[PDB]
């Protein structure tokens, strides 16, 4: 049936340019008004631009005014935002929508959404800090810190896979200055501190990062 | 622009309840609303348009109605499927505007109360010239906390970082809050505290300069 397919999201600095598609199946471009609408993480949906491709004729909202391109290619039964001068705020994830047809001005099918974020910190690896802990004969909690790193995703195993039970890494915090932090913990047998080892390795790809880091208590 | 006033911003309702969401335009934009459902990660959703028709599929459970410039979306016995997030918006003018969201939840009959687990700062930060603190959260439904951070006794406003939670595996729910200080003034207190409010209950963890 009906269908919208997006591409095109990605990381970008304040200044840059992304292209956005919106491949339409099952009905006719022609037919009908292509939406673009943006939702900002955590946030409510806005409306970004309009075009109806029969006569190319299109509208924005001021906050784009300038910056964004709404076009349609009905040969291709394909719609497209250009984005350039790209700002922080511009991050969200972007769908595309169409109204229904004829009168039919709510949005009947949308499609699954591309996200864009703007960002002008650079990347950075983490540093890594051990977390160090005591219930004689009960458990124990010992970590690490994965501080200042950019952008997502950074990767945690503990003694190189090995240990699983009692393993809990949690989402990181984005922090104020544009970068992440996380950590990682194990809740250990308190017999077992100052004699089994226990190494978290921590794994940052975009800077080509990798860091074992010893917990002693 | 036309504002969309939605309310209430969330409510935790039970399988069986009639739930209304109430939408009011800050002009006449006739009947020109529609009600969208969006689930995390989904695109919303078309459940009603023109205020109160039916969109094609969609469950007759689902009405909608207009009063002047009030609009309401009437669930007249939720099912399971339908605890999601739900936006109005106008269609009468350009550009369209949405409201600003219904979270419906599921209520925890038997709520989950967290674990904390909270850490004083690294060596290796301390060295540095330093601190973080970790307080770290976990295994609680519903998926609303709020952290407070004490020196000694008295609350610390600055340097507070708390992640939003984000719902584990277990669709529980998990988040970390974390204080930034100087050395000098982890030093210069006798403990630091992590509290953790769920449901109105507080859950403590001290860490000291030891």
């Known amino acids: 049936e009906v269908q919208l397919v997006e591409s095109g999201g990605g990381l970008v600095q304040p200044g840059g340019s992304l292209r956005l598609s919106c491949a339409a199946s099952?009905?006719?471009?022609?037919?009908?008004?292509i939406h673009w609408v943006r939702q900002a993480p955590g946030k409510g949906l806005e409306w970004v631009a309009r075009?109806?491709?029969?006569?190319?004729?299109?509208r924005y909202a001021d906050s784009v005014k300038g910056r964004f391109t709404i076009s349609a290619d009905t040969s291709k039964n394909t719609a497209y935002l250009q984005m350039n001068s790209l700002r922080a705020e511009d991050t969200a994830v972007y769908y595309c929508?169409?109204?229904?047809?004829?009168?039919?001005?709510?949005?009947?099918?949308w499609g699954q959404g591309t996200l864009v974020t703007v960002s002008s910190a650079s990347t950075k690896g983490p540093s890594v800090c051990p977390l160090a802990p005591s219930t004689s004969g009960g458990t124990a909690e010992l970590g690490c810190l994965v501080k200042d790193y950019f952008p997502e995703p950074v990767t945690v195993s503990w003694n190189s896979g090995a240990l699983t039970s009692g393993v809990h890494t949690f989402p990181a915090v984005l922090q104020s200055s544009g970068l992440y932090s996380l950590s990682s913990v194990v809740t250990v047998p308190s017999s077992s501190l100052g004699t089994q080892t226990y190494i978290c390795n921590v794994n940052h790809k975009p800077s080509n990062t990798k860091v074992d880091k010893r917990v002693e208590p | 622009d036309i504002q969309m006033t939605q309310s209430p911003s969330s409510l935790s309702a039970s399988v069986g309840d009639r739930v209304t969401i109430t939408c009011r335009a800050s002009?006449?934009?006739?009947?020109?609303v529609a009600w969208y459902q969006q689930k995390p990660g989904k695109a919303p959703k078309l459940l009603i348009y023109?205020?109160?028709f039916l969109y094609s599929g969609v469950p007759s459970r689902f009405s909608g109605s207009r009063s002047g410039t009030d609009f309401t979306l009437t669930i007249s016995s939720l099912q399971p499927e339908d605890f999601a997030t739900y936006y109005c918006?106008?269609?009468?003018?350009?550009?369209?505007?949405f409201g600003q969201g219904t979270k419906v939840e599921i209520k925890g009959q038997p709520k989950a109360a967290p674990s904390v687990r909270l850490f004083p700062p690294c060596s290796e930060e301390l060295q540095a010239n330093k601190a973080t603190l970790v307080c770290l959260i976990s295994d609680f439904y519903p998926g609303a906390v709020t952290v407070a951070w004490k020196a000694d006794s008295s609350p610390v406003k600055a340097g507070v970082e708390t992640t939003t939670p984000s719902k584990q595996s277990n669709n529980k729910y998990a988040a970390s809050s974390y204080l930034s200080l100087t050395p000098e003034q982890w030093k210069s207190h006798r403990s630091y505290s992590c509290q953790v409010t769920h449901e109105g209950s507080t859950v403590e963890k001290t860490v000291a300069p030891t």
């Open positions: 929508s169409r109204w229904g047809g004829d009168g039919f001005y709510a949005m009947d099918y």
């Open positions: 099952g009905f006719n471009i022609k037919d009908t008004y």
């Open positions: 075009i109806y491709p029969t006569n190319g004729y299109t």
């Open positions: 002009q006449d934009v006739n009947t020109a």
């Open positions: 023109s205020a109160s």
């Open positions: 918006q106008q269609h009468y003018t350009t550009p369209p505007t």
